[PDB]
């Protein structure tokens, strides 16, 4: 019968690793670098696009940064199509929580359920895992500003600053060097771009190869606003920190 | 060789190896003999123990008052098939108030076994069966094999070294076929036939199993002290 053609996506190696998870991570490591940095007064997400052609419609585009609800966003590294499947799940899961409890979903709870979905694909059902890693940036009134990452294994951890995709070893070293706890959001923005600027496999960072988003308390008192930077706004922030 | 991974595969010469390997567990099974006159049908089976401290595996199972079988091979597979037969004899009574013809019992077993020889992920039955009964057309003996092939016989034997008993009966044919109205003579001829298949061992009292069914005798099993009479 059909056993002959079954890759057995959910088995252990003799060393006790999940091949398909390892290979998925290997896939992700060639994806555009995405960085999250957490400040005391907000969170930055920055991500680099897979080498743009000049004819790409840059402003009506969303490859790397997605809004989950009003208080939570994610940066994507890996297969985009795989990521959208998981994003709609997350978007719905946030809406059920609101509908049930009349309170926006705590960031960790949303992250756990997405990570639990990923885990399932590594233990049962014989399907390939999702080739995606997320950086979650969000706010809630229990823990305030939070950064998380999850990867195809279904493991998730929290961070002050972190990167995913290409050259994370390089980038993690640079973030470790210049990050400090008391840091404000505009310091974090600067750090995020300077880090991508040094780790990029391109000749130099331009606005047309970037996506950028903040989650500040930057509107009117004890309330949280999500900003997905328009192309022009990135170009300006690239000048204001003298990268171009 | 490359064609024996599962039942759903034919070899280049048109054989079904998993079925043939299933047939092979029968050959490893302890010997059992069946034979009949026109008035009774008899099963004799040599039972096997694990060692001197163990019981001797039952080889004969009653199916209805007028039907039963002996087994050689995988015992649980006999339990499954004999159970299926009990149900079919039962269905026939409750619905039609009719005793199940031994011929139809054969066809039903054949078709049950066959399903397992044409679909993925199952496996053939690993047991051979000798079915005796007395129905509306007299005494019958049947030989079931897990290929699905069922055969009506005057007498036969299956299991290890069944070939001796099988030739003996083939010689004795015109003698035993006419042991009518005599239970104990047909049994003796049964016991004699099984003896042509013994080696380094003869029939003891907790070693030998006989079953008889016929004109005015319900299918009944003899073990223990009530076989001594025949050694």
């Amino acid at each position: 019968g059909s056993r002959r053609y079954d890759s057995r996506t959910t088995i252990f190696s003799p060393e006790g690793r999940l091949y398909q998870v390892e290979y998925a991570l290997e896939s992700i490591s060639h994806a555009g670098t995405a960085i999250g940095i957490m400040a005391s007064d907000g969170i930055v997400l920055a991500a680099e696009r897979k080498v743009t052609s000049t004819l790409l419609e840059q402003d009506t585009s969303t490859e790397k940064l997605y809004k989950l609800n009003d208080k939570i966003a994610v940066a994507v590294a890996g297969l985009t199509a795989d990521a959208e499947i998981l994003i709609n799940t997350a978007r719905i899961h946030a809406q059920n929580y609101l509908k049930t409890y009349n309170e926006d979903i705590p960031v960790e709870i949303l992250v756990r359920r997405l990570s639990d979905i990923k885990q399932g694909y590594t233990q049962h059902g014989g399907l390939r895992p999702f080739g995606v890693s997320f950086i979650y940036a969000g706010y809630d009134d229990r823990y305030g500003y939070q950064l998380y990452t999850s990867n195809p294994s279904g493991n998730y951890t929290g961070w002050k600053a972190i990167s995913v995709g290409a050259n994370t070893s390089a980038a993690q070293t640079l973030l470790q060097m210049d990050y400090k706890d008391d840091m404000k959001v505009d310091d974090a923005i600067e750090l995020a771009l300077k880090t991508l600027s040094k780790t990029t496999d391109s000749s130099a960072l331009t606005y047309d190869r970037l996506e950028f988003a903040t989650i500040r308390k930057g509107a009117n008192d004890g309330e949280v606003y999500q900003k997905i930077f328009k192309p022009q706004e990135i170009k300006d922030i690239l000048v204001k920190t003298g990268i171009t | 060789n490359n064609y024996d991974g599962d039942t759903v595969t034919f070899s280049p010469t048109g054989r079904l190896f998993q079925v043939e390997y299933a047939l092979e567990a029968i050959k490893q099974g302890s010997v059992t003999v069946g034979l009949r006159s026109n008035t009774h049908a008899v099963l004799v089976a040599l039972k096997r123990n694990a060692d001197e401290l163990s019981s001797y595996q039952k080889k004969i199972i009653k199916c209805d008052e007028h039907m039963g079988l002996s087994l050689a091979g995988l015992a649980p597979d006999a339990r499954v098939l004999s159970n299926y037969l009990r149900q079919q004899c039962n269905y026939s009574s409750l619905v039609f108030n009719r005793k199940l013809a031994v011929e139809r019992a054969g066809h039903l077993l054949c078709d049950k076994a066959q399903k397992n020889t044409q679909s993925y992920g199952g496996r053939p039955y690993g047991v051979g069966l000798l079915i005796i009964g007395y129905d509306k057309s007299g005494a019958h003996l049947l030989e079931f094999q897990p290929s699905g092939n069922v055969t009506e016989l005057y007498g036969t034997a299956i299991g290890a070294r069944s070939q001796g008993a099988k030739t003996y009966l083939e010689r004795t044919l015109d003698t035993f076929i006419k042991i009518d109205g005599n239970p104990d003579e047909l049994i003796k001829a049964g016991v004699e036939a099984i003896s042509q298949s013994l080696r380094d061992e003869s029939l003891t009292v907790d070693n030998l199993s006989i079953a008889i069914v016929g004109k005015d005798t319900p299918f009944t099993i003899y073990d223990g002290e009530a076989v001594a009479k025949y050694i």
Binding site: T100, Y101, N102, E103, P106 | -
Partner: protein, 195 residues
């Protein structure tokens, strides 16, 4: 079942619930506690169809206790109340609905406010200064409309409650064998033992 009341004063929520359990022409019990603690600062009283009431209250209690352990955190009363409403709103269109009315009294620690939610078996939720289920409301709402004040102390709330229980013992056809009273405040849930 029958009598369940709640009053929310300045710093606490008070639940009063009748002690009688009646089947036919027999009062089977006169000391029944028609309440479950859902979390250390949330309490739920219940009245309605025999069997359904306890089965529902315990089912809710189990889910809220599960949530508390999973998140190592206590849901707000507003959140617990919305969870409960949804369950009843599901139930009303089930094959056999839960016929249970509840009051949820809680102290929200993030807000430092007491809260009282009245929810009927249809899943009809309202937050109220005082609430009642069943015939009780026909006497107590107008009484409370008169005597209640928003800034009352827990002691003043208990007296306001005595007034309600006095009226109900005077005018209600059935002997409900008094009430068990429970206060929910910043320090959790405690039971008054003399009423």
């Amino acid at each position: 079942m029958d009598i369940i009341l709640g009053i929310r004063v300045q710093d606490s929520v008070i639940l009063a619930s009748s002690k009688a359990v009646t089947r036919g022409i027999s009062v089977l019990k006169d000391s029944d506690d028609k309440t479950r603690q859902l979390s250390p600062h949330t309490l739920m009283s219940f009245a309605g169809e025999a069997g359904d009431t306890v089965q529902f209250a315990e089912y809710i209690q189990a889910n809220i206790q599960l949530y508390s352990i999973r998140e190592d955190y206590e849901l707000s009363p507003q959140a617990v109340s919305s969870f409960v409403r949804q369950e009843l709103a599901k139930s009303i269109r089930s094959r056999r609905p839960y016929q249970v009315n509840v009051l949820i009294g809680g102290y929200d620690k993030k807000k430092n406010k007491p809260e009282l939610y009245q929810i009927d078996y249809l899943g009809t939720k309202v937050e109220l200064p005082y609430g009642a289920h069943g015939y009780s409301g026909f006497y107590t709402f107008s009484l409370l409309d008169h005597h209640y004040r928003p800034d009352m102390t827990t002691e003043e709330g208990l007296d306001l409650l005595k007034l309600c229980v006095q009226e109900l013992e005077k005018r209600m056809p059935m002997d409900f064998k008094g009430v068990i009273v429970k206060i929910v405040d910043k320090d959790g849930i405690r039971q008054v033992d003399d009423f």
